Amino acid sequence: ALTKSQTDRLEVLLNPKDEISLNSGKPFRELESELLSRRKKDLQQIYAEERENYLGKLEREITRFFVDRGFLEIKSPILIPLEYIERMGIDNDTELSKQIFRVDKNFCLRPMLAPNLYNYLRKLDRALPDPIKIFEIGPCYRKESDGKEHLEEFTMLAFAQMGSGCTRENLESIITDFLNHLGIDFKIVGDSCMVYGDTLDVMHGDLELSSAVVGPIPLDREWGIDKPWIGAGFGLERLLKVKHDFKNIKRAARSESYYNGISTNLHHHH
Amino acid sequence: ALTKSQTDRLEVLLNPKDEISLNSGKPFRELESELLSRRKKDLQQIYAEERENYLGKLEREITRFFVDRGFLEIKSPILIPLEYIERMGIDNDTELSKQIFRVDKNFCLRPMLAPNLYNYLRKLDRALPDPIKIFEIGPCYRKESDGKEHLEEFTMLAFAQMGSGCTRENLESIITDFLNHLGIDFKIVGDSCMVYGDTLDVMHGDLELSSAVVGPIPLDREWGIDKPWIGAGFGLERLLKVKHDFKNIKRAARSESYYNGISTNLHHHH
Ligand SMILES: Nc1ncnc2c1ncn2[C@@H]1O[C@H](COP(=O)(O)OP(=O)(O)NP(=O)(O)O)[C@@H](O)[C@H]1O
Ligand SMILES: Nc1ncnc2c1ncn2[C@@H]1O[C@H](COP(=O)(O)OP(=O)(O)NP(=O)(O)O)[C@@H](O)[C@H]1O
Ligand SMILES: [Mg+2]
Ligand SMILES: [Mg+2]
Ligand SMILES: [Mg+2]
Ligand SMILES: [Mg+2]
């Protein structure tokens, strides 16, 4: 019989592709030695051939998709004014407000990309022709409880279009083209949302890949937006979790503990 | 005569390529209208053709260079334990320690990439063949005074090699190949450093592009490293400042105020 500590250690070393059962009755050291050997070989192969990090590679793939479809690539601050949170209509007694990492007294780590993209839409509307199409990929931060679907440090893609063409049909068509490109099956379900009102949730089984919005909405006035728009946000670690059939999203995160879903802690357990 | 407010506004709208002088005696509105028209056209052209963000594009170019030369692409946490700072030998009464953005009580925004790369070197040495070559590009954070060479939110590349081949000659040769690839002239100057001891500073005129280190050093013991190593760190916004002849590094930063060095604030000044 394996202890809980031994089972947890084997789970860290097990990968989705492995045809190995921890409930097979084999001794711990036998299972551990096989898995350590497989993971070392996996890392050696990555190092010998591709050498690309899954999160970096997916960002680059996504960037090419959106650039090629006419969207401007934005890189905006990660450390943002706390005032942008309140201006998103997030009251400081709300659950989301309690998820914010504060920095100093007046700043925070962004929990979402919307504020910066709202400002870019307003500014670019003075220079660029209709429709204005932008996107951003980068780190976002939320305090979360320990779970297999959430990270405190994650990576979000968000895109937005403003002006003509800002229909639910076009929004769903962009989402469909994007997730087809990635080879990810999904469905769309309507839900309510305290920030945006009603959303379209992009679901893979019970896992939310994205929330999307058809504007205009009452919040727009606070950002100086008065045109129709559509937009969506996606978690890159969730996309990787689906693509690679990871059991826990930690396998896809910025991490010291995993490289492309392979444990970096390859010591023997005693 | 132009007021200081008017001169500052024209400086924001002026780009290095412009053959326009603010000291020419022309009225403010004439200079402002010409510059606004040039910047709008610049943004329109970016939107019509390349659509790539300078910081994103440079990260991708750098990533390809290092991956193709056998270095593993790392993406590690930006929000790190405050204990890693002390373990770098940064005492809490030192000037660098005062530059750290603290988060919660026990975390901070990373001011450097070295701690995470030290841990990756230690772990990967159990799996990968000699020499171990890794790199990371991403956000770093330091409190700074207002100046044209420093950002509080910047982007660092750091690479390291550990094992064989870890000579000053090989380090300089990698730096030279890299900066040749980018088309940036430089010189190397020795300096002292409280964290690493002696460094090699990679200079473009009076601007430090990088600091580099030939190990081993006494700090290595604290990270479980006992082999020779070489490494260097570079600021991407500084590389862009040199490449594009920006007068202030803010033009190259993650920003709401500039897109590829072009002002996003294209209103009229009254
Ligand atoms: N903590 C997190 N970890 C990983 N991905 C996240 C996290 N929070 C949000 N995302 C991703 O970002 C997308 C847009 O954010 P948002 O719609 O606000 O998330 P959410 O409604 O809080 N999702 P959930 O907490 O699973 O019910 C989500 O659909 C996820 O793909
Ligand atoms: N505040 C900053 N803004 C932009 N780039 C930075 C900043 N701090 C460091 N870098 C870059 O990161 C590289 C490695 O960091 P490090 O050697 O610690 O910088 P440094 O010695 O503090 N440079 P300096 O402050 O100009 O004397 C530097 O050579 C810069 O290219
Ligand atoms: Mg949530
Ligand atoms: Mg949602
Ligand atoms: Mg400094
Ligand atoms: Mg230095």
Curated annotation (Swiss-Prot), chains A, B:
Its EC number is 6.1.1.26. It is found in: Cytoplasm. GO terms for cellular component: cytoplasm. One of its GO terms (biological process) is tRNA aminoacylation for protein translation. Keywords: Aminoacyl-tRNA synthetase, ATP-binding, Cytoplasm, Ligase, Nucleotide-binding, Protein biosynthesis. It catalyses: tRNA(Pyl) + L-pyrrolysine + ATP = L-pyrrolysyl-tRNA(Pyl) + AMP + diphosphate. GO terms for molecular function: ATP binding; pyrrolysyl-tRNA synthetase activity; tRNA binding. It is an enzyme of class 6 (ligase). Belongs to the class-II aminoacyl-tRNA synthetase family. Catalyzes the attachment of pyrrolysine to tRNA(Pyl). Pyrrolysine is a lysine derivative encoded by the termination codon UAG. This is Pyrrolysine--tRNA ligase.
